[PDB]
Every structure is written in C-alpha cells, then in structure tokens.
Amino acid sequence: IVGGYTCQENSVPYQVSLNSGYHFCGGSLINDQWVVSAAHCYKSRIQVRLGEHNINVLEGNEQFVNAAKIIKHPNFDRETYNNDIMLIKLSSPVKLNARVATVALPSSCAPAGTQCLISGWGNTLSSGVNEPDLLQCLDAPLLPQADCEASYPGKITDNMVCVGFLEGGKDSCQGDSGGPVVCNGELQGIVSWGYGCALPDNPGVYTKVCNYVDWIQDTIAAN
Ligand SMILES: [Ca+2]
C-alpha cells in the first residue's frame, strides 16, 4: 500500500496473508474455512495466516492454516487478468473471534463514488521496493468506469473496476495482490493489477467481486 496508513492492530480481521515461506499475496476470509484471493496468486502449496498485524513478529493472535483446495476461476486469463479470482479451502476451520472474523460478500455492485478500505502488506513505495512489517490501510473511492477505461484503453473488462486516485500518490501495489477492497462491510474488489504503483492517471485495477457471488457460493457448496 503506497501512501496509506498503519491499520490499528486487528482492525481488519478478515485480512489474511498467503505464505509460501514468505508473504506473497493477501486475501479475505469469507467463512470459517474459505478465503477468496486472486488467481494470479496461485501456488501448489500455500499456508494461510490469520490474525496478523506484524507479519514478522509473533504477537499471540495468529492462526496458521494450510490450504487444502486451491481453486482458480476456470476462465482466468493470465494475459489480461480477466476473472482474476481464486478460492482457497483451508484444511480445517479457524477459530472465529475479534482478530479473526469473516467479511461479507456483495449484495450488489457498489456505485462509483463509494469510499472503500484497501489493506495489505505489499510494497509501500511508488518507485523501488519496501515491504512493511505492519498491515497498511488505505481509504480510496471507487472510480467511474469511464475513467478506468480511459486510463487503460482496451484492457478494462466488465469484471474489473478501478479504485483509487487519478492524481497518484496513494494506491495498492505488488504484494497487496489478492487482498480486499471492502466498502460498507462488503467485499467489492480484489487487488489485481495496474501500471506501476501510485502513478498519476494510472489507478489500481481490481476484480469486480459482485460479478462472482454465484460462482463463489456454487464452488463452496460443490467442494
Ligand atoms: Ca504476527
């Protein structure tokens, strides 16, 4: 998260860290045994870490659970990042509590102008790389599709939505990928891609979760 602020300890209890020996992506807990992330964060073996704040220090609220089923969206296109959504079934249900809680699926697609919360342990710089220890937060509005398409000519599909600032400075970045975009208590987006990080006229692009509610539920029920 570039230009964000450090989140209060455990204030985003649905945020999870995908670990493959190191933190590589983020995700959202949608129920005691399922996490939703980005298809581009796929790895054959993943350890999901819940109740995290400081990613490099044991604080007492952590719950490390291994992924049992890693399911990428069948129509994920790695070149366009279309359908960049993935589901992870944990090997066992987690203990839900204050620092480990679920986030709601969207009942509808949020209108442009809605203020959302983005969080993650991704890169904090607009140039170069700096991975933070503490969970970063960012308050950003959902942008109009016209502005999204104008920023990325011929690359924005209807399963993508831009969130952020056209003037730059604040944005999600590598490492935040798979992470949550929560507006009014509902998961509206998933960190997917973007040109650079926090650059003017290049807002972040996110997977439009409201288009996948059915697939999510169907898959959870079928697995
Ligand atoms: Ca920790």
UniProtKB/Swiss-Prot annotation:
Q: Reply yes or no: does the keyword Signal apply.
A: yes
Tell me where in this chain the Peptidase S1 domain is found: 1-221
Tell me the protein's name. Answer: Anionic trypsin-2
Q: Which PROSITE patterns match?
A: TRYPSIN_DOM, TRYPSIN_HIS, TRYPSIN_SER
State where Ca(2+) binds. Answer: 52, 54, 57, 62
Question: Which cysteines bridge via disulfide bonds?
Answer: 7-137, 25-41, 109-210, 116-183, 148-162, 173-197
Q: Name one Pfam family in it.
A: Trypsin
Instruction: Spell out the reaction equation it catalyses.
Output: Preferential cleavage: Arg-|-Xaa, Lys-|-Xaa
Q: What is the source species?
A: Rattus norvegicus
Tell me which CDD domains the record gives.
Tryp_SPc
Site positions (Required for specificity) are 171
